[PDB]
């Protein structure tokens, strides 16, 4: 029993972390096989972050303009290319610690684990969700960019996130591992701001199933709702609309507890209208939206405390 934000074990990612320096800028890269991956803004005059032209800035660099440091060993850079908002540095040594891995582009509402590093040395691991507005609520100081997010399926590390920047609200933005930003954001020092966010309804419902699986039923009710009438309420409380596909996804959790998904939505609807006051659900004073159904299945017993 218990339910905690739980991160994947970070071992296989840690063995891939290196330091990349260009000029006076130092940040982290991700050494897989013979390639290190990092934010292209490693090349940038921190004065022309204002309006960088990267193609133009990159052509001015050779191979030996970059230093890759893996522990106390220097890696020789023997090629380089820009892929969207990342650099692909070809080093002379394949990484012996290279896990089986996929690059994956994660979808809003999904979670991943973040291995925060500084100077190519890992300092901490935490969990977070891709918000609907394409930001993460991370914890990042300067020199953290190139820090990565990941999930682990079996022994296979699916990388989904590499860190580029912080926004005026103190939330975070970056790219997939092909260098494609999450959200409408760019790797220039300009006025950009997180869009309005919504609560992830799929996740809230899943976490309400988690509560029941662990043995709490206090928030349930003798009521059901149509999909559509749930959504008039969702909209008013700034929750994402529920879809039939979201209903489908909650299939197993609902089979495991015996609460029909629209029964749970009815209970959600009431939580939003009457509050919780005084009471908690899995410890929480509030309704939690950063656990997917997959995360609930992963961590709870496949047997309900009935």
């Amino acid at each position: 029993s218990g339910f905690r934000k739980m991160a994947f074990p970070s071992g296989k990612v840690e063995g891939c972390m290196v330091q990349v320096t260009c000029g006076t800028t130092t940040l982290n890269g991700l050494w897989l096989d013979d390639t290190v991956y990092c934010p292209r803004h490693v090349i940038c005059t921190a004065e022309d972050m204002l309006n960088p032209n990267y193609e133009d800035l990159l052509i001015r660099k050779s191979n030996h303009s970059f230093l890759v440091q893996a522990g106390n060993v220097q890696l020789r850079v023997i090629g380089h290319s820009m892929q969207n908002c990342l650099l692909r540095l070809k080093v002379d040594t394949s990484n012996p610690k290279t896990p089986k891995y996929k690059f994956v582009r994660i979808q809003p509402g999904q979670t991943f684990s973040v291995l925060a590093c500084y100077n190519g040395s890992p300092s901490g691991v935490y969990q977070c969700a891709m918000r609907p507005n394409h930001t993460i609520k991370g914890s990042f100081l300067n020199g953290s960019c190139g820090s990565v997010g990941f999930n682990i399926d079996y022994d296979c590390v699916s990388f989904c996130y590499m860190h580029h920047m912080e926004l005026p609200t103190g939330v975070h933005a970056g790219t997939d591992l092909e260098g494609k930003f999450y959200g409408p954001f760019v790797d220039r020092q300009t006025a950009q701001a997180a869009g309005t966010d919504t609560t992830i309804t799929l996740n809230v419902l899943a976490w309400l199933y988690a509560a029941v699986i662990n043995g709490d039923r206090w928030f349930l009710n003798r009521f059901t709702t149509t999909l559509n009438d749930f959504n008039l309420v969702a909209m008013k409380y700034n929750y994402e609309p529920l879809t039939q596909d979201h209903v489908d996804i909650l299939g197993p959790l609902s089979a495991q507890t015996g609460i029909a998904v629209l029964d749970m939505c009815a209970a959600l609807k009431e939580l939003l209208q009457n509050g919780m006051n005084g009471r908690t659900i899995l410890g929480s004073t509030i309704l939690e939206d950063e656990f997917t159904p997959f995360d609930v299945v992963r961590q709870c017993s496949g047997v309900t405390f009935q």
Binding site: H41, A46, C145, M165, R188, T190, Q192
Partner: peptide, 4 residues
Amino acid sequence: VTLX
């Protein structure tokens, strides 16, 4: 913006 703050590039970290």
